[PDB]
Amino acid sequence: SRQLVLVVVFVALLLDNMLFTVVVPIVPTFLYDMEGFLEEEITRVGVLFASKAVMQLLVNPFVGPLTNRIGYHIPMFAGFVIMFLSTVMFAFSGTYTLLFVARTLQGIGSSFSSVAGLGMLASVYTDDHERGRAMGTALGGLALGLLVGAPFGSVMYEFVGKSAPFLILAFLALLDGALQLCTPLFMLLKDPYILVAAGSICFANMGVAILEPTLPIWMMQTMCSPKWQLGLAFLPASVSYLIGTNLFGVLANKMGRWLCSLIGMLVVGTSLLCVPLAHNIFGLIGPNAGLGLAIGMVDSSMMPIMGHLVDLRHTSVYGSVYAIADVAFCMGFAIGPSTGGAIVKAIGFPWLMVITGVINIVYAPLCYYLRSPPA
Amino acid sequence: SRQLVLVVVFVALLLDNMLFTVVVPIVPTFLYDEEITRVGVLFASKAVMQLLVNPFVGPLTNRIGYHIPMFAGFVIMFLSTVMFAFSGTYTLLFVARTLQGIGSSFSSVAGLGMLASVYTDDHERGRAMGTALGGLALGLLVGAPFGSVMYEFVGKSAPFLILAFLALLDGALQLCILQPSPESAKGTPLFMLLKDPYILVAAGSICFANMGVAILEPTLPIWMMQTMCSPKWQLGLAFLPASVSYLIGTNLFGVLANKMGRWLCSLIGMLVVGTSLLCVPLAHNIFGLIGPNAGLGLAIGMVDSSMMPIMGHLVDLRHTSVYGSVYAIADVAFCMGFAIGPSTGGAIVKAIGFPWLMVITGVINIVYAPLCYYLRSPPAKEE
Numbered sequence: 112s113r114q115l116v117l118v119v120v121f122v123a124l125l126l127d128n129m130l131f132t133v134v135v136p137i138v139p140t141f142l143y144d145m146e147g148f149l150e151e152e153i154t155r156v157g158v159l160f161a162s163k164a165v166m167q168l169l170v171n172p173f174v175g176p177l178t179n180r181i182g183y184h185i186p187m188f189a190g191f192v193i194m195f196l197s198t199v200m201f202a203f204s205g206t207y208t209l210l211f212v213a214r215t216l217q218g219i220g221s222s223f224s225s226v227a228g229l230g231m232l233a234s235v236y237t238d239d240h241e242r243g244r245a246m247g248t249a250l251g252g253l254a255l256g257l258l259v260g261a262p263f264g265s266v267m268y269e270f271v272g273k274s275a276p277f278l279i280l281a282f283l284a285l286l287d288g289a290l291q292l293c294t295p296l297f298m299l300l301k302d303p304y305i306l307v308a309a310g311s312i313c314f315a316n317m318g319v320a321i322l323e324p325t326l327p328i329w330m331m332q333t334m335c336s337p338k339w340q341l342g343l344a345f346l347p348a349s350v351s352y353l354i355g356t357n358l359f360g361v362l363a364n365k366m367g368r369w370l371c372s373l374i375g376m377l378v379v380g381t382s383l384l385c386v387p388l389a390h391n392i393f394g395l396i397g398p399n400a401g402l403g404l405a406i407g408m409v410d411s412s413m414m415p416i417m418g419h420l421v422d423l424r425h426t427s428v429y430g431s432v433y434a435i436a437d438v439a440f441c442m443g444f445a446i447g448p449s450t451g452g453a454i455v456k457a458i459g460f461p462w463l464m465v466i467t468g469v470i471n472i473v474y475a476p477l478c479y480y481l482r483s484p485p486a
Numbered sequence: 487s488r489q490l491v492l493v494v495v496f497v498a499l500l501l502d503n504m505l506f507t508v509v510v511p512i513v514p515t516f517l518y519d520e521e522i523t524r525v526g527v528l529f530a531s532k533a534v535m536q537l538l539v540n541p542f543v544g545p546l547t548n549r550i551g552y553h554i555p556m557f558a559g560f561v562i563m564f565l566s567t568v569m570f571a572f573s574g575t576y577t578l579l580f581v582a583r584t585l586q587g588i589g590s591s592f593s594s595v596a597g598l599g600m601l602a603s604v605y606t607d608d609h610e611r612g613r614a615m616g617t618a619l620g621g622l623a624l625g626l627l628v629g630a631p632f633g634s635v636m637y638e639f640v641g642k643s644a645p646f647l648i649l650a651f652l653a654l655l656d657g658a659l660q661l662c663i664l665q666p667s668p669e670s671a672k673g674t675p676l677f678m679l680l681k682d683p684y685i686l687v688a689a690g691s692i693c694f695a696n697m698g699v700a701i702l703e704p705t706l707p708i709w710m711m712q713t714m715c716s717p718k719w720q721l722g723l724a725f726l727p728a729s730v731s732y733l734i735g736t737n738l739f740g741v742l743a744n745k746m747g748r749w750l751c752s753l754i755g756m757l758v759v760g761t762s763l764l765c766v767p768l769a770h771n772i773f774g775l776i777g778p779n780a781g782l783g784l785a786i787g788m789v790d791s792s793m794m795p796i797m798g799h800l801v802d803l804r805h806t807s808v809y810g811s812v813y814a815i816a817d818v819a820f821c822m823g824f825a826i827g828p829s830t831g832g833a834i835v836k837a838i839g840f841p842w843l844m845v846i847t848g849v850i851n852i853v854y855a856p857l858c859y860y861l862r863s864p865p866a867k868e869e
């Protein structure tokens with residue numbers, strides 16, 4: 112029924128965020144277990160983190176005609192089985208080579224699910240009013256999974272073993288399988304307005320993209336924190352992000368969207384600058400919460416601007432914003448860690464954070480162009 | 487004793503900067519007895535001459551102390567207000583402005599040097615200069631309506647005579663406490679302190695912020711008349727929130743700078759002033775400028791109170807303990823924006839436009855802020 116498909120889509124997006132948010136606090140300690148020596152492996156961890164983004168980009172434009180030719184349910188099956196396989200090898204992987212294949216399979220399955228589930232939700236809901244509510248429910252489940260995934264793997268690593276969280280995620284995925292069993296984008300990427308908005312979103316999310324694969328190694332090398340607080344350190348970045356996106360989605364229309372994006376990028380730069388100063392775990396709640404709140408600001412201010420820009424000058428569909436918005440996230444999560452590993456090899460982590468903050472601040476006042484576009 | 491020195495510097499900045507703003511609503515109306523180009527140069531006469539006298543006042547403080555320059559500044563300010571009280575021609579109204587500029591430069595450099603000298607603790611030093619900037623903001627806020635009501639109700643010679651009497655009282659207080667009747671440490675030459683990157687960053691920060699309230703003030707009434715079509719009684723009232731927010735910001739952030747962080751304070755102030763300048767030209771009425779002007783004044787007070795004690799902190803960290811030249815550089819940074827702004831702002835507005843000028847200033851401040859992170863912890867000199 113209509114509630115069943117929404118439930119399975121919500122659970123699928125939940126697991127999709129759970130896997131990506133549980134990989135981040137496990138892989139560096141996983142490499143530490145078999146063996147300061149992460150300065151040489153930071154590049155390989157950056158490539159392993161950018162593999163999913165690069166695979167999602169390479170398989171992005173192929174699922175379009177595939178869903179039209181063979182329907183929407185069939186591409187669901189491939190994505191779910193591939194993500195089940197990626198989960199099962201991730202709990203069972205022992206070497207660096209298997210992790211890359213697991214990440215590529217996870218990226219392909221994430222792309223297939225993100226296409227097929229939203230396509231099904233659009234197809235089922237033809238009432239023209241409940242579709243937006245279902246999309247909001249899916250986004251809320253996405254945020255809930257983002258919140259839950261970060262403390263999960265770090266807490267259940269040194270306490271209940273290593274394969275426990277991945278096996279639990281695979282078992283939860285098996286539950287959803289039984290429930291489920293019963294103006295193109297290249298034409299929209301030539302005007303300056305949409306390109307500026309996409310660049311703003313990408314440069315806003317690149318900070319949290321670079322914070323993932325390079326922060327735990329810095330924490331282990333300097334702060335001497337235990338192995339269970341590494342996943343807890345990212346909790347403010349999720350909680351503050353959720354409160355910020357709710358509040359500023361409420362409040363952004365009053366004080367202007369372009370000012371929202373400008374102030375959000377500025378506070379992103381300031382938070383990233385203030386991040387590498389703390390010498391204890393308690394010095395990271397401020398900057399991380401600020402960065403999450405700022406990313407909520409920039410996303411909630413840039414999505415309606417993208418929608419209005421597409422509507423005013425071009426003809427749009429139910430999911431025009433999803434194609435462009437997922438492009439900016441893919442550039443962010445693909446160009447963040449791969450370049451960040453080489454940057455940390457050549458120069459220090461604080462220099463990388465200063466560079467990211469400087470880029471965000473310098474790109475900040477280019478959002479003046481987006482105020483009142485013409486026709 | 488050390489508490490009374492702050493009272494002397496507080497009074498000195500109050501009287502000198504009150505004369506700066508009292509003559510504003512008296513000169514263009516009484517001069518009448520094309521025009522903007524010359525009347526505008528008269529308002530900028532103090533800034534041009536004060537910038538020149540700063541390099542000749544800095545090294546002078548190392549050889550004769552901080553008392554004689556302050557007494558000379560008081561005497562020059564009294565002479566300037568006396569000359570303003572009786573002059574009634576365009577030629578005689580320029581020498582008085584030049585004398586007021588010389589006295590203002592002398593008083594500012596001597597007072598800041600003395601305040602740096604007496605107060606040694608950095609956290610303690612961050613409050614005296616905050617209250618001094620608050621007194622300066624109070625003088626700039628109260629000079630305009632006092633002189634306006636005095637001219638409108640009692641005459642042209644009334645407020646200048648009252649300011650002269652207040653200057654006499656201030657000089658009597660100065661003779662009472664300071665007794666203006668050579669430093670052991672030989673301070674570094676001024677040319678060497680212009681090579682330290684931190685000093686240049688701080689001076690550029692103060693100079694850029696002081697370029698925003700400057701290039702906004704003379705060119706704002708013209709755009710208001712051209713677009714909003716407002717009556718004559720709102721042009722003065724538009725800039726009042728900037729002064730009020732400047733006073734509040736300078737006091738509170740002189741309190742808060744030692745706690746929250748000097749470099750973060752300067753960076754947030756620069757970002758706020760840049761965004762305020764960006765959002766200024768979007769207003770479609772007088773009520774659209776209440777917010778951006780208040781943010782601009784608060785951010786400028788933030789930057790000023792953050793970058794005042796940092797100069798003395800750097801001078802103690804690296805160079806010898808002599809504070810005259812660094813605050814001479816600070817006054818040069820303060821006066822450069824005020825001497826460049828009024829004389830050319832109409833030219834830039836006629837050439838490219840007021841919104842483009844605001845966007846350029848805004849963008850220079852937003853695209854300059856991340857350079858401040860360098861003042862987090864300068865390395866010390868070799869032992």
Ligand SMILES: COC(=O)[C@H]1[C@H]2C[C@@H]3c4[nH]c5cc(OC)ccc5c4CCN3C[C@H]2C[C@@H](OC(=O)c2cc(OC)c(OC)c(OC)c2)[C@@H]1OC
Nearest residue numbers: 131132135250261319345348349352406414432433436437
């Ligand atoms: C990895 O998972 C993601 O990439 C999601 C998030 C990325 C990023 C992030 N990762 C973290 C990991 C942490 O632990 C280490 C801690 C903090 C963070 C933060 C804080 C900040 N944060 C933002 C998250 C945003 C999510 O995207 C959407 O919410 C979304 C919403 C829509 O509706 C408006 C869309 O349609 C238009 C849409 O389509 C493109 C996507 C995005 O993809 C689903």
Ligand SMILES: C[n+]1ccc(-c2ccccc2)cc1
Nearest residue numbers: 626699728729732783786820
């Ligand atoms: C030296 N100085 C003069 C004027 C100001 C000022 C700033 C904002 C609003 C009004 C005055 C600040 C400093």
